Design a binder for this molecule. Structure first.
Ligand SMILES: O=C(c1ccco1)N1CCN(C(=O)C2CC2)CC1
Ligand SMILES: O=C(c1ccco1)N1CCN(C(=O)C2CC2)CC1
Lengths: 412, 412
């Protein structure tokens, strides 16, 4: 019968910092992690900025020997995973290694490595492709390498649900624990899509902000002058743990994971429906799963990508689900500061939702100078808002019409 | 408690055929689908052959214009999915569409599209990258496009666990039904990795057979002259359905899905342990999940990839799990005929396991001319073996040490 799931450890790389506390400091200060990209020449591209991880030192985590085999998205996912395991205080033993698994996902995986190898193939032939090309680029190798390095023998898998990946990974990993398939899961996502193919591909779709001359102002969820999402890199990982398992070892518990929803829009390959119908179905599934009155929701970490259609769909969904209570809750987009970490967005936003519960503060939506038509909720414009938060919801929506919602609440 | 899950529809593209019955006729005749790869200059490559899908006509499923947006692996996954839904006779309505979801996966997704868009980017710059590059290449777009086309609003996700994908996809979809999160799921996997990048990438790891002179003899699981796997393309999809839901509409039930195991080896990025400890844990987990004694197993569809270490690991795991019963079951590798469909392997092999139950016949391991040291089980060498089969297992092992086992039983 269904067990309770709590969060005992968190880990992160983001455009705002190389761990959770540094990133969260940035979030509560309204700081932008968006800047012109330095790691390649984008003069031919329509978008030349994004949210890069700054000063990542893989030698805090991995031998130079292992690191050279791995795409940046795998390095970032292992960094966040290792942080989360250390933060949890969990000791892996022969007694518990079969009950600890991992589900770290990605939207696009090792696109930098794949591009570099494609260049080698075309210019120099197949004998110049790296022997590590497949295992060093494939999405499941965060799960795989973490399992090998820590000796985790529980369920081992990876999701890829585009911009919903991190939210789905955490929710499904919680179900594994709830249903008795594991006692502990490391779950989240990682992404590093800032190669020519990534910036070029989203650029070809005209999906990205082109505010090159003012990158920190580009991500402006619900602002009338928004012109698309900002591409960002990084990782989030949580240690999810069965409640009695955590209590038995005297774990520090950040919060309880009480609800998870999924739904499909069944609408369009890339566009969310204007009325947010699929997002509303997803949130209602999540709130029913948590056994909650919708009026218990205090804070929503929105998907809030800074696209014209997505941002207004989310207002329409939140009004549909919460009715008059839509005017009492606080909803913000931390993507205003971090940009869109794609498959890692739901993982870092789950962590920000847990810290909102820990610190009783709604992070701001920076850049919200002129809320658009109908964007008249408490969107925490400009500055962090201390407030009572017992229940926090984190939403994600992705290509293929795929929706996820996590519901967290305070634990005492 | 848990609801029962049955298989009511199946769909496939394989190197043996453009549907399930043609593919299965090839399997029971011991036919090879392996041949030199056409319309591609593989002179510079150490492997020049594989399992291609022959004569696929996407316009039976999609308009030319919608097909142009999608990588071949997505086309293949949608073909199998549409076949499976047609075969099930399910009618989607407003009363059930929130209870019908999708989990179609892939191991390495849209290599062909990545190759072609790299070519554009390198020769012409980023403004010639297709607008459809991202949504037409990402792994979750089989689930996405299928849900849009059929109006499915249930759980919508995608796994990517390398060579384990199709097995994990089916098993997790069965959990969604068992635990009441859906009444129907379409689940399975698809793969098209015969580009330069797939053959080049696996070739750089020296993982592939190089038997260019006799491609039909290349895939020879447990044979002493095996020299690595054969890369193949295609897709498998099953309609999974709650038992009372299937009985109520008079569905034709192929078999029951009674068990699912996962485990991580935590051993090595690409190599399984010689003793098959991880595969043994996974099979024991799946039999425990089914409430079955090892003695009740009649037929195993091995992973049986034709690699030196993988094939012998599986013999060790089967001896370990089954003890005095290990010689009484039959175990075969249909990869001897189909080659290795990577993330689609577990999907087509689940279908072959279900048909072994329907037809009371173990498919052959072709090319097993000289069994290797210790390969002394009943590996169904050369020719199909009619026999009693009440319980059939299908095993998958992949990069990262990820394992999956499905347990099927006859239904009456
Ligand atoms: O949790 C870990 C960790 C686990 C295994 C190896 O490192 N760390 C150390 C590395 N960190 C930093 O460098 C902080 C940014 C300053 C973050 C905390
Ligand atoms: O989803 C994507 C993608 C990148 C750009 C557009 O879509 N990728 C591709 C490459 N993949 C792989 O597994 C690597 C090849 C080995 C799967 C994930």
């Amino acid at each position: 019968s269904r067990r309770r799931v709590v969060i005992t450890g968190m880990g992160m790389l983001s455009p705002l910092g190389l761990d959770v506390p540094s990133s969260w400091e940035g979030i509560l200060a309204g700081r932008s992690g968006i800047a012109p990209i330095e790691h390649m020449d984008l003069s031919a591209y329509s978008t030349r900025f994004g949210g890069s991880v700054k000063g990542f030192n893989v030698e805090e985590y991995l031998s130079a020997k292992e690191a050279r085999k791995l795409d940046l998205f795998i390095q970032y996912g292992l960094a966040a995973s290792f942080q989360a395991v250390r933060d949890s205080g969990l000791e892996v033993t022969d007694a518990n290694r079969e009950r600890i698994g991992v589900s770290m996902g990605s939207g696009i995986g090792g696109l930098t490595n794949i591009e570099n190898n494609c260049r080698s193939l075309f210019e120099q032939g197949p004998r110049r492709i790296s022997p590590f090309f497949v295992p060093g680029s494939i999405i499941n190798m965060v799960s795989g390498f973490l399992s090998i390095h820590l000796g985790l023998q529980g369920p081992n898998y990876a999701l890829t649900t585009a911009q919903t990946t991190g939210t789905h990974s955490i929710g499904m990993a919680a179900r594994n624990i709830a249903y008795g398939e594991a006692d502990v899961m490391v779950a989240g996502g990682s992404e590093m899509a800032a190669c020519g193919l990534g910036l070029g591909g989203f650029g070809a779709a005209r999906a990205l902000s082109t505010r090159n001359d003012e990158p920190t102002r580009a991500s402006r969820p619900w602002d009338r002058d928004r012109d698309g999402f900002v591409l960002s890199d990084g990782s989030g990982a949580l240690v999810l743990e069965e409640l009695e398992h955590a209590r038995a070892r005297g774990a520090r518990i950040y919060a309880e994971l009480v609800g998870f929803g999924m739904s499909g829009d069944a609408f369009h390959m890339t566009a969310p429906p204007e009325d947010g119908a699929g997002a509303a179905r997803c949130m209602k599934n999540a709130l029913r799963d948590a056994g909650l009155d919708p009026r218990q929701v205090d804070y929503i970490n929105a998907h809030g990508t800074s696209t014209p259609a997505g941002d207004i769909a989310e207002i329409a969904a939140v009004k549909s689900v919460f009715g008059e209570h839509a005017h009492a809750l606080s909803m913000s987009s931390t993507k205003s500061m971090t940009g869109h970490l794609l498959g890692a967005a739901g993982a870092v936003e789950a962590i920000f939702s847990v810290l909102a519960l820990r610190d009783q503060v709604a992070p701001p939506t920076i850049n919200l100078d002129n809320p658009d038509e109908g964007c008249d909720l408490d969107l925490v414009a400009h500055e962090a808002k201390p407030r009572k938060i017992d229940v926090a919801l984190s939403n994600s929506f992705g290509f293929g019409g795929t929706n996820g919602t996590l519901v967290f609440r305070r634990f005492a």
